[PDB]
Amino acid sequence: GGMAERSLLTGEEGWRTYKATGPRLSLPRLVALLKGQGLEVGKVAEAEGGFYVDLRPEARPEVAGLRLEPA
What we know:
Helix content is 14%, strand content 28%. By secondary structure, the protein is an alpha+beta fold. It has a single domain, classed as Alpha-Beta Plaits (2-Layer Sandwich).
């Protein structure tokens, strides 16, 4: 297959882990914002001041309401 980055949360190939922060950020708000941008959501976990979330490696991590930086 085509080799791809692995999730730092699960080790599963096909994911890039990001740290997500933003105002009033809850897990449901995070999911809703990512899905509204059409982004496939992998594992989500807790981070300092926000969440870790797996997105596809080539997904464009630009979502109004969130700051997304690779973890």
